[PDB]
Write a protein that binds this DNA or RNA. Structure first.
Lengths: 52, 111
DNA sequence: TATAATGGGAGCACGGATGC
């Protein structure tokens, strides 16, 4: 995970960071022999787009 | 070499989708499914085998298959897609047959 | 017209042009 933007607000002796974070969460999909992959390596997909 | 289940299914799939793509090209081009099929097959196999087909209304020669190939390549991208599908379909057909050639021997030896 | 099946089967002789 990486922090794109960092906002800081001071209260008392402490600082409160509002962070804008961007990261990637993996999900595995098991492909059975009767299934074929319609997507290449490193391709970008959206909501609704067919993978296998 | 013999086909793994995955490989077999793949080739069969490419064949079916291929035939469908030939039908689609028949719809778009307004041409004959047979003529298109013969042209695609001719390009996959090469100029080595070119001959007149009994069902075709037109004699099949390098000239005609060239004109038809050019009328196919003159299609828009999304339409030209089905041409590629068809080509790879014919190739898959060839490999499927060539792979299943042993079954024929094992059956025929009993006759 | 669809379970899956995938590599065969059998069975003397001498003379002369060639071929490695």
């Amino acid at each position: 995970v990486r922090a794109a933007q960092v906002e800081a607000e001071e209260e008392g002796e402490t600082v409160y960071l509002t962070l804008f974070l961007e990261w990637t969460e993996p999900k595995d999909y098991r492909v059975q022999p009767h299934m074929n992959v319609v997507v290449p390596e490193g391709a970008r997909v959206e909501a609704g787009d067919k993978i296998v | 070499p013999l086909l793994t289940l995955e490989e077999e299914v793949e080739l069969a799939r490419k064949v079916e989708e291929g035939m469908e793509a030939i039908k689609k090209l028949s719809e778009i081009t307004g041409l004959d499914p047979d003529l298109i099929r013969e042209v695609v097959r001719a390009k996959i196999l090469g100029s080595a085998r070119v001959r007149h087909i009994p069902g075709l209304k037109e004699t099949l020669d390098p000239k005609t298959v060239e004109e038809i190939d050019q009328k196919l390549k003159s299609l828009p991208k999304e339409h030209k897609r089905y041409l590629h599908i068809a080509r790879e379909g014919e190739a898959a057909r060839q490999h499927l047959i060539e792979a299943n050639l042993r079954l024929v021997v094992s059956i025929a030896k009993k006759y």
